[PDB]
Amino acid sequence: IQRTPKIQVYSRHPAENGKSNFLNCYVSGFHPSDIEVDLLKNGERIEKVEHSDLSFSKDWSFYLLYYTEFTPTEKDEYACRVNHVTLSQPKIVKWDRDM
C-alpha cells in the first residue's frame, strides 16, 4: 500500500521573537516508512535535527517527529521539506507561528 504523508510544522511553545524554542515537523499517515524530512532555515537544511523512534497508528500508517532548537525572529523563514515515494516533488510547508 502507498499513503501520502500529512505534515504539520509548529513550535513546541507559543513563539516569541528572540526567545529560544523548538521547531517540530510531524509527519504522519504515510506508508511505506522510508521518508526524507529536513527542517530549513531561509531555504537551507538545518544540520542538527533529531527524530523520534518510528511508530504507527491503528490503520498501520507511520508517524515521526523531527525537531531542532531554534530562535524565531522577524526576519528568518523556517520550513519543513518532505520527500516520499508518493510525492512527485518534495513538499515544503512553511512554519507559521499561528498554526
Partner: protein
C-alpha cells in the same frame, strides 16, 4: 483512569544488502518507555523514561534477548511472506506488529490485542476473545491453520491477561509521579483577520496528557462543523500533546462562537469565547 501497555515493532527488508531495519517501541498509555533500533550502537533495549531505569540488569538483559528474538521472527516472516505473495527478491517489504493490554480504572484486565500487518495491510489478528484468529486473506488463512495447530493463541492469551497486566501495574506504581498525573490542556483563543469582513478564531489546547481530547465549536449553543478546521493531535516533543480547532466567522460576530474542550484532566469541560479587547 483507564490504562494500557503496548509494544510496536516494524521491520523493513533491505533487498540490496543485509538484514531488515528493525525498530521496536514500548508505551505505557501515551508515554514511550523503551526502544530498540537495529541501526543503533548499543544493540540493547534502551530506557526512554526515568521510572524504567529503576529496573535491574536481569530486566535489561531479558528485554534485550526478547527484543532481538522479535527481530529474528520478523526477519523469517518477511522471507515467508515474500514466498506466500510470489514476490520478487528485489523489492523492500514491511512487517508491522503490535500487541498489548488495557486495564480499567480499577487496574483489572479489560482487553488484549495482538495484530500483524504486511505491506501496510491487515494480515492476521487475534480476536477480542483471545482464542480465535482473523485472517484477512488466503496467505493469512495458512498462518491461521498453523497457529491453531501450535496453541499460539493460548500462550498469547496467558501473556495478555497475566504478565502484560502485572507489568503494567508495576510500571504505573513505579512511574506514578508522571504516569498517574493528568495534565489538563492549557487553553487560549487567537484571532486572525482573513479579510476586512471575516476572521479565523483558533482554539488552542496545549501541553496536555494523555493525548485523548475533544475540541468542538458551537454557534449560538449548537454544534458547528461548516467552515471549521481541526488538526490532528500532535506531540509537543516534551511528552505532552497539542491540538487546535478553528472557525471562520463574520467580523463583529465572535461572541456567538464558543470552543468546548473535553479532557480527562478537566473535572468539567471548558468553554472559551473570544475576548473582544484581546
Amino acid at each position: 483512569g483507564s490504562h494500557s501497555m503496548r509494544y510496536f515493532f516494524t521491520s523493513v527488508s533491505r533487498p540490496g544488502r543485509g538484514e531488515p531495519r528493525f525498530i521496536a517501541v514500548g508505551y505505557v498509555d501515551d508515554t514511550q518507555f523503551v526502544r530498540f533500533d537495529s541501526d543503533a550502537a548499543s544493540q540493547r533495549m534502551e530506557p526512554r523514561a526515568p521510572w524504567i531505569e529503576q529496573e535491574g540488569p536481569e530486566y535489561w538483559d531479558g528485554e534485550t534477548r526478547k527484543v532481538k528474538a522479535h527481530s529474528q521472527t520478523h526477519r523469517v516472516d518477511l522471507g515467508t511472506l515474500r514466498g506466500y505473495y510470489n514476490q520478487s527478491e528485489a523489492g523492500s517489504h514491511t512487517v508491522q506488529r503490535m500487541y498489548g493490554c488495557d486495564v480499567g480504572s480499577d487496574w483489572r484486565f479489560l482487553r488484549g490485542y495482538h495484530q500483524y500487518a504486511y505491506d501496510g495491510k491487515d494480515y492476521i489478528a487475534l480476536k477480542e476473545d483471545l482464542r480465535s484468529w482473523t485472517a484477512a486473506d488466503m496467505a493469512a488463512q495458512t498462518t491461521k491453520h498453523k497457529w491453531e495447530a501450535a496453541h499460539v493463541a493460548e500462550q498469547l492469551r496467558a501473556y495478555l491477561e497475566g504478565t502484560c497486566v502485572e507489568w503494567l501495574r508495576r510500571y504505573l506504581e513505579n512511574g506514578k509521579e508522571t504516569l498517574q498525573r493528568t495534565d489538563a490542556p492549557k487553553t487560549h483563543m487567537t484571532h486572525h483577520a482573513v479579510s476586512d469582513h471575516e476572521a479565523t478564531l483558533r482554539c488552542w489546547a496545549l501541553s496536555f496528557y494523555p493525548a485523548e481530547i475533544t475540541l468542538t465549536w458551537q454557534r449560538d449553543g449548537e454544534d458547528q462543523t461548516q467552515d471549521t478546521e481541526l488538526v490532528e493531535t500532535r506531540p509537543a516533543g516534551d511528552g505532552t500533546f497539542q491540538k487546535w480547532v478553528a472557525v471562520v466567522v463574520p467580523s463583529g460576530q465572535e461572541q456567538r462562537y464558543t470552543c468546548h474542550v473535553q479532557h480527562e484532566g478537566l473535572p468539567k469541560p471548558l468553554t472559551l469565547r473570544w475576548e473582544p479587547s484581546s
